[PDB]
Every structure is written in structure tokens, then in C-alpha cells.
Amino acid sequence: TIPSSQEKIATIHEYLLEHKELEEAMFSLISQGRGRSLINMVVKSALNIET
Amino acid sequence: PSSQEKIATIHEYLLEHKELEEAMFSLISQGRGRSLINMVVKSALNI
């Protein structure tokens, strides 16, 4: 399984450290009970940028 | 909350919702990280 989940998470982690505004924004949504809309929005975008 | 606490919170959420891990990884690795940031920041600023 390549890339592994660990490599995928590591990539996201490094990206958050390079863009702290995204870290703050995700934390804000998740800690305030809005994680589901975060998922929905990002999945849809990923699937469009593919399709 | 410290920055480490915020990352720990995000990390647990990603393990609980693998589609979000996969979708973020796809956007970042395909050079669309900036649009990902913009969308999430906008959303967080409205909420």
C-alpha cells in the first residue's frame, strides 16, 4: 500500500506546518462541531479537481 | 490551546475520517493545496 497512510498523514502534517492558517482553520471548524462540513467540502473539491 | 494540541486534534479527526485524509492528500500532492487552504479558511471565517 504506497503511498502508505503514514506517508499521507506526514504530507498533510508538513503542509499544515508550512501553512499555519490552514491548521487554525481546520482546528476552528473541528473544535466547533463543524468537521462534517469540512469533510464534505474537501471531498467534493478533491473529486472535482479529479473529475 | 497550544499549536501541538491543535495538530493533535486535527490528527485524531483525520484518523477517524479517512476520506478527509485521502481528499486532502490528493489536493496537496496534485498542487492544489492553495485552493484547499482558501476554501477551508473561508469556511472557518464564516462559522
Q: Of A15, A24, A21, which is closest to residue B27 (Cα–Cα)?
A: A15
C-alpha cell at A44: 467534493
> d(Cα A2, Cα B43) in Å, to the nearest integer?
32
Q: Does the CB of B47 have a partner CB in chain A at under 8 Å?
A: yes
Residue B39 CB contacts under 8 Å (≥ 6 apart), including other chains:
A41, A42, A45
Residue of A nearest to B36 (CA): A42
What does the longest C-alpha to C-alpha distance in chain A come to? 34
> d(Cα A39, Cα A37) in Å, to the nearest integer?
5
Residue A3, Cβ density class (10 Å: 0-12 exposed, 13-18 middle, ≥19 buried): exposed
> d(Cα B42, Cα B26) in Å, to the nearest integer?
20
Tracing cell 473539491 back to the chain, one arrives at A45
Task: Supply φ then ψ for residue B2, to 5 degrees.
Answer: -70, 170
How was it solved?
X-ray
Structural domain boundaries, residue B42: 3-46
Helix A5-18 × helix A20-31 angle, to 10°: 110
Q: Do A43 and B25 touch (CB under 8 A)?
A: no
Taking CB atoms and an 8 Å cutoff, what residues of chain A touch B47? 28-29, 32, 34, 37
User: How many domains are there within chain A?
Assistant: 1
CA distances from A19 to A1, A2, A24, A26, A51 (A): 28, 25, 9, 11, 26
DSSP classification of residue A6: H
